[model samples]
Target chain A: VIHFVFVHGASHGAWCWYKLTTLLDAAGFKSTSVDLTGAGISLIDSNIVFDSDQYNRPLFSLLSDLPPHHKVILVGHSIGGGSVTEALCKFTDKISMAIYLAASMVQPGSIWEYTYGEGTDKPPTGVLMKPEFIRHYYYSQSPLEDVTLSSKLLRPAPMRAFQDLDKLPPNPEAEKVPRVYIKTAKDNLFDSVRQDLLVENWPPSQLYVLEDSDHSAFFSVPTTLFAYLLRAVSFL
Target chain B: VIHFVFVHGASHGAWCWYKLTTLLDAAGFKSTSVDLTGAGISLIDSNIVFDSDQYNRPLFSLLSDLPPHHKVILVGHSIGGGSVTEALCKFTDKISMAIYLAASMVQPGSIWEYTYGEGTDKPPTGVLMKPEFIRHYYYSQSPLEDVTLSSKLLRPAPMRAFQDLDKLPPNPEAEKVPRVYIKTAKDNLFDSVRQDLLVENWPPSQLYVLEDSDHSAFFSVPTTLFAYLLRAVSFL
Candidate 1:
C-alpha cells in the first residue's frame, strides 16, 4: 500500500486537502493532510513570524513520524512544493516520488522574488471582483450557489507566507524524483505557453494537459482528477 | 452543488481525475472529465495539423452540451488552461470561475515558438535534455519507486500543440471571470519566481500556494490537493 503525505501551500491549512482525502480514502490508500506551523488550524498563532523554514515544519514532523524504513509518496502543492523539496533533502530515502501540481519549478538558491518577480506582492490585478460580474462569469461553470452561501467562509491569507517565498532553501537534487506536471490550461495565473516552456526543462517527466478546466481542476473535474491520481499510483 | 468540467494536459486522458472525483463525489458535486482532440483516448491517428482550435473543440463542445443556463466551475490544468480561455470566450455566461493550476498565463498573440524556444526544427540545445540529472534535481521529494515508474511514462508531446500556441485568441473580456491562481511552490517545470511573475502580470481572482508539494500535487499529496479544491470551490 502506498502512503501519501500531503503538505499545503502558504496561507492554507490541511483543511485544503479535504476533497482529495475523500478521494484517496475511497481508493483504499492511506494519506495524511497536514497544516504548516503558521497556517491552517495548527497551534501556531497567526501573528507568528513565518519564515521559509517554519513553512517546512509540517513536512519534517510528518517524515519524522513515519516508521523507520517505511517508504512513502511525498506530495506538495504551490508553495508546499518548496517545503517538499527541503524535506526531501532531509528524508530522501523515505520518499518514493514527488509530483508538482503546476507548482513552482525553481533552481536552488533562487529567491521567490527573483523567480516570480518582486511585484507579485500586490493584490491580483486582472480579475473582476464585483459580485454580479463574478456571478455572470463563474456561475456558468461552477457552483456559484454554494459559493454565495459560503462566501463568508473565505478568509484572507497571511502575508508572511508570500514574504517567505524569498527565503526558500536550495534543492540541488529536486530533479531526481520522477516528475509529472499537471498543467491547468485555463489558469489565469500561469500561461499555457509558459507552462510548456517550463516543463521542457525537467528531467524524466511527462506533461498532461487538463483542458476546459481551471486551476482548481480537482474540484471542477474530480472524475478526471481522480483518474490521473490512479494512473500515478499505477506508475508505482 | 457544482458541476465541474475538467480538461487535462498532454499525454493524459480523462482518466487523470480519478482521485479528485472521489473527493468531489463525496462532497455531492457533479464533475466531468474532458479528453481533448488529439489527446487521451480521443487521440486519432490523423496527424491532421493540430492547432489550438482542435484542442479547443472539447471545451467548446462540453460547454455547448451543458444547459445554456447551467453554470459550471471551469478548471484547466497545464495546456488545458489555454482551452479554458477559448471556452470562456464562447461560454462566458455559463462559467462560474476559472481556476488556474500553476498554468501558463500567456499574453494574446504570443507565438509558442518565441515562448518555448525553437523546438526540434532547430539544433538540439544540450540545455533542453540534461538526462535524469535535471529531473533528479527537481523531483527530489518524490519516492524512488514512483520516479522510476514515471521515467517510463515520459512520452514526446505532439509538435502540433507546441506550434499552435502562437495562435492564442484574444480575451478582451479575459477579466470577465473570477480567477484564482494556485501556485505549486516546488514545481520543477517553472520557477516559483516565474510563477509569481505570471500572477503579477495576469493577476488571479485569488492567489494560493501549495507548500510541501512538487508539480503533481494531486498524486503526491492527493488529500492536500483535494482540500485546496474544496476551499476554492467554497470561495466560488
Candidate 2:
C-alpha cells in the first residue's frame, strides 16, 4: 500500500487535503490527513491560550497513534511544514519520507525570520490574516468554487506556531529518510525566486517545480499537485 | 505486470474507460482497453458492416497477441459481455477471470434471446441509441461533464453481436474460471429485479452491489465502480 500522511498548513486544516487524498485513495493508497490542535476538525478551547508547543500538540498525538513498524510518506503544506519537520525530528523512525509542498522549509534557525520577516517576527499574540486578503496573497490562481469554500473553512492561524523554530537533532534514521520540496512557480506567499536560492543551500534530496499555481496548489491545480506528489514518493 | 483487458459497453469504445485506466496505470496495473470494430478507436469499413465475428475480432486478436504464459482479467460492461462470453468459450486459457459489470450474463442457449426479444430478431444493421435517451437510461446520476462527454463519444453498436447467440463450447477450463457480476441498483436499462432473476440461476462466484449508479457506472459512479473493481481484482 502507498501510505501517505498529510499535515495541513496555516489557517487550513485536514479539510484542505480532501481532493489530494481522494485521488491517492483511488491509486490504492491509504492516506491520513491530520489537523493541528485548534485547527480543522480539532476543538479549540476558548478558555485558554496556546503557545507554539500547545498548538503543535495534535500533530504529536497523531504521530504517536501510528504504529512504529509501518513506513509512511509524510506530506506538509504551507505552515504545516513546521509540523512535519518537527515530527521528522521527534519521531524520525515513524516516517519513511517527508515532502514539503509550497511550505516554509527553512534552515536551522531561520523559520520565524523567513515566514513573517525578521525584527517584527511575533504578531499581536494570535494575529490571523483577514479573509479579504486571502484571494490576493494566497489563492490568486484558484478556482472560484474552491476560493469560496476555502474562505468559509479557513480558521485563524496561531502566530506562535510560525514564530518558533524547530530544533533538528542529529538522528541517523530521520536523516536517512528522503526529503523533497515541491516549489510552486506562481507562489505569492513564498516568492519562487527567493525560494529557489533559499532551498539551494538546505540541500534537500531533490527539488521539483509546479506551474500555474499559487500558495494553494492544492486547490488551484490539484492534478499538478498530485502528479508532483507521485514523483516525490517515487524517489522513496 | 498485473494484467487486465477491459471491454466497453454498448456504443462505448475504449475511450470510456480512460478514467479507470488512468487509475489502474497509477496503481501499476498494465491495463488494456479495447475498441470493438466500428467503435471508439477502431476503423470500421464504410460499405460491408461487421457481424458478431467481426465485432469480436479485436478482442480475439488482443488475447492472441498477449504472451501465452500471462493471464488476464477480462472485464466487460453491458452488451460487451457478449464478446467476453464468446472469448471465454473460444480462448479460455487466456482469461484468469471474467467480470460482468451491469452486463449481460446469459445461460447457454439464452444468449441472443436474453438481450433482444425473440420474434422480431433484426433491427436496422447499425442501430444507434438516441443521445437524449442516454442520460435517462444510463447516466442519470452522473456528473454533467461525464454525461456531456459520453454524448460526444457515443457510437452505434453492431446489431449482429446482440442478435446472434454466443456458442459456449464444452471447455472445462473456461467454465471453471472465477466469475463476478457487479449489480447496479439504480440501473434503468437492467432493472434490479430483472438482473437478480437473470443471474440467479447462472450464479457467478461472487455478486457485488453499487448504489446511486445507473447502467453506466463508468460515467455515473466511477469512484464507487472503481472501488468495487479493486475489490473484485484483489481476489485475483
Candidate 3:
C-alpha cells in the first residue's frame, strides 16, 4: 500500500485537499492532508512565527511519525512545492516519488521572497487586499454559497513564509524521485505553454494537462482531478 | 501634459482598453507602450502560430510613431508592466512618467502568468533559464561571472501571459504618474508566499526593494535604469 502526503498552496490549508483525499481514500489509498505549522487548524490560538523553517517543521515531524518501513508519495500544490522538495532532501529513503501540482520549481538556497519580487512593506498596487477579500476571491468558484463556511476554514498565513523562499536546501534527491506535473486547462495561474516548458526541463518528469478547467480543478472538476491523481499513483 | 498608457498583463493585446484611452489621456496626459509580442522582439517565426487576432503585436511600431505632442516616457520591463500601464492607454499625449525598472502591477482582466499559474505546456519552470536563475541567485550580490553572456540578454518567453487576479480592469491608472519599480529583489513568480501573501497584496504606487536583487535590478541599480531614461526628457 502506498502512503500519500498532500500539501496545499498559499492562503490555503489542508482542508483544501479534501476532495483529493476523499478520492484517494475511495481508491484504496491511505492519505493525509498536512496542515503546515502556522496555517489551518494548526494556527488556532498559537503564536508560532511563520517562516520556511517553521513551515517545514511539520513535514519533518510527519515523516518521523511514519513507520520505519512505510514508503510514501509526496504531492505538493503551488507554494507547497518547496516544502515537498525540502522533505525529499531529508527523507529521500522514505519517499517513493514527488509531484508538483502547478507549483513553482524553486531552486535551493533561494527564499520565497527572492523567488518573487520584494516590496517595501506589502505587495505592490492591485495585489493588496483585506484578508477577507482574499478568501472571497480565491474561493469564488466554490458552490457552497455560505460565506461563513469559507471564513471558518481560512487562517492568516505566516508573513515569513513569503519572505523565505531562498532558504530551502537543495534536494539532490530530486533527480532520483520520479516527478510529475498535473496541468490544469484554462487555469488562470499556470497556462499550457508554461507548463510544457517546465516539463521539458524536468529530468524525469512528465506532464498531464486537464481540459476545460481552471486553477482550482479539484473544486471545479473533482472527478477528473481524482482520475489524474489515481493514474499518477498507479504510474509510480 | 503627461500621458500614461499601461498595458494589460500577459496574453492580452492593447485592445482590452479601447474605451479608457479617451477618458484618461484627454485630461492633459498621454501614455502608452505597445505589445511586446515576443519577450523582447517581434514574433515573426514563433513555433506556435495562432492568428493575427490571437498574436500580441509588437509595440515598437506604435511607440516609435508617437505624435510630437511631447517627450514620451517609454517604460517596459518584466512583462511590459510599466510600459503597458503608462504608455498604451494614453498614446496621444507626451509621457512625462516612464517607469520601467520593475514589472508593473497586474491590471484587472490582465493575463499575467506570474500571479496565476501558467499552462502545463509552457510552465514558468522551463522558460526560466540561467539568466533568470542567475538573476534570482546572484544579482543581489553581482552579475554572474562565467556564464554565456549571449544567452543572457534575449531569452524567449512564452506568448501567453499568466492569469491575473480576477475581475480587474485592463488599465487601472495609478494616481501618480512617472513612477518606476526598481525590482532589485528576486522572484516575480506569484506562487511564493511573499508574492501571494505580502508582495501582491501590498499597496504602493511605486516601489524599489533591494533586499536581494532578482529580475532586472542588476541593470537597473548600478546603471540607474530609470534615471538614465529620464535624462533624455526635459521634465523630471
Candidate 4:
C-alpha cells in the first residue's frame, strides 16, 4: 500500500492538498493532509497557544494511528519541509522517506532566513506575511480563480516556529531515510537560481527538474506533477 | 460542473462504484452512488419487502433533492440499467442522459429474455444464480482476489423485478434524451454475437464498441472507460 502524509507550506492549510489528494486517490494511493497550528482549518478548531509540536499535532498523532508496520512517505511543500522534518526526527520509526516540493530543506537552523537570504532584515518575531505577498509568490502561476479563493483562506505562520530549529535525527540509520525533491521551475519566490542552488550537488536519486512549473505546481500543472510524482516514487 | 449518479447491477451495491467514485473525485467531478434494497451494504440495514421503487428509490428521490434547474447524467451497469430506465421514464424531468455499460437497455417486456434468452429454461421464480456461474460469467475478467471477495458479497435479484416490464416513456421528448451504450468487447456473458444482436443496426450515436473490454470494465480498465466515457459525453 502506498501511503503519503502531506504537510502544507507556510500559511497554507490541509485544503491546499485537496487536488493532490484526489490525484493520488485516482492513482490508487492512500493519502492524508495536515494543517499546522494557527493555519488552515485547524486554527478555527484548535485555539491553544502554539506549542511547535501542537502545530503538527495531527501529524504526530498519525504515527500511532497508523498500523505499526505501515511505512509512510512524508511530503512537505515550501516551509512545510520543516514541519514534516520535525515530525520525522521525533518519530523516525513511522516514516520511510521525505519529499520536498519547492521547499527550504534545511536542518536545525534559520530555515526561513536561508531562503530569505543573507543580510535581509529578519521579520519581527510575531509578524505574519501578508496575503497579497502570498498571492504574488505562491499563486503566480496558479489560476486567477484559485488566487481569489486562496486570498480568502490563507493564514499566519507562527514566528515561534520560524525561530525554533528542528532537532536532528538521533541515528545515522534514521538520518539516511531517502530524500526526494521535485524542483519547480518558473516559480516566483523559489526562482530557477535558488532551486538549483538549494538542490546543488545533491544525490543522483532526485528527478532533476519540472520545467515551467510553479510554487503551486499542484494546482497549475497537476497532471504533470502527478506523472512526475509517480516517476519520483518509482525512481526510489 | 459534471455530476454522476451511478447505478449498480443486480445484487451489487454502491460499493461497486468505489473505484469510479475516487477516480471522478480525482478528475474534479461530483458523484453519488446508492445501494438498492437487499443489495450490497443496504441489505444489512433495509428490512422492507423489495418495493419495485425501492429497487431504484435513490434515482427517483433525486427529483426532490435536486434544485429544479439542476440536471444530471445517469450511469448504470448491468441490470441496473432497468432501474435507471425506469427512473428516466417516471422522473425524466431530472435527468439529462443515461449511459449503459453491459446493461439491460432492452425495455420492460424482454430485458431478462434478452439476457436469459428465449426458450432457455426459466429460473424457478425466486432462485438466485449460483456463485460458480456468476464467477464464470462476471468475474472471468476480474482478479482472483476480487473473484473471491465478490463471491461473498453478491446477493439475489428479485425475480419479480426481473419479470416486470417497465413502462415506456409517454413522450417523444423523454425518448429523445441522450443515451450512450458502451459495448464490452470480449465480454464473457454478453458475447459479441449477442451484443451485436442486442444492439443490431442501432444508430452510430447509440453503440460504442470498447475493445478488449469485459462486463467488469469498471474494475479492469477504469481509466480507459473513463476517457471514453468523457468522449461519449462530449460527442453528445
Considering every candidate listed, which one attains the maximal lDDT?
2
Consecutive 10-residue window with the lowest summed lDDT within model 2 chain A:
A110-119
In candidate 4, how many Å is residue A215 off? 14
lDDT of 1 by residue, B1-236 (tens): 68888877654556656666666664557888877765556645214424567656777877888876789987776666777766777787889988777666664545011112345586321122234543444345555655555455433345565455525567666557788777878887667898899788777778878775566555555556665676677677
Predicted candidate 3 versus true structure: per-residue lDDT over A57-159, tens digit per residue: 7778998788889888888877787788778777888899888777765545431121112455744211222534542444444433222223333444555
Writing each residue's lDDT as its tens digit, candidate 2 over A46-122 gives 11324666777877787788775877788888778877887787888888888988776665443121223223455
Instruction: Write the residue-wise lDDT of candidate 3 on B147-215 in tens digits.
Output: 112121233344333222122345445324554444544544422234333235434345545444344
lDDT of 2 by residue, B1-236 (tens): 77888998777899888777765554456889998887886787311244677788889998998886988998999888878888888878888999988887775554111123223474445556676787777787777888788878777666655677465545666678889998888987889887787579679988988767788777766655666666677678
> If you score just chain A, what TM-score does every candidate get?
0.75, 0.87, 0.79, 0.84
User: Across residues A9-50, which tens digit of lDDT does each residue of candidate 4 receive?
Assistant: 877788887777775775567898877766787744222323
| TM-score (C-alpha, index-matched) for candidate 2 | 0.69
lDDT pick, better of 1 and 4: 4
Candidate 4 chain B least-lDDT 10 residues: B109-118
lDDT (tens digit, per residue) of candidate 4 on B1-236: 77789888876778777766665654456888978766777643322323576566666776558887887888888878778778777767778888888776764333121223123495332335576576667766766777677778776665555555355534555567788888888688777776666565333256777675677777755655665565566654
TM-score of each: 0.45, 0.69, 0.43, 0.49
Per-residue lDDT tens digits for candidate 1, residues A31-69, read 888877656666665334335566566768778888887
Ranked candidates, highest TM-score first: 2, 4, 1, 3
Candidate 4, residue B102: Cα displacement in angstroms equals 0.7
What's the residue-level lDDT of B195 in candidate 2? 75
Per-residue lDDT value at A82 in model 3: 72
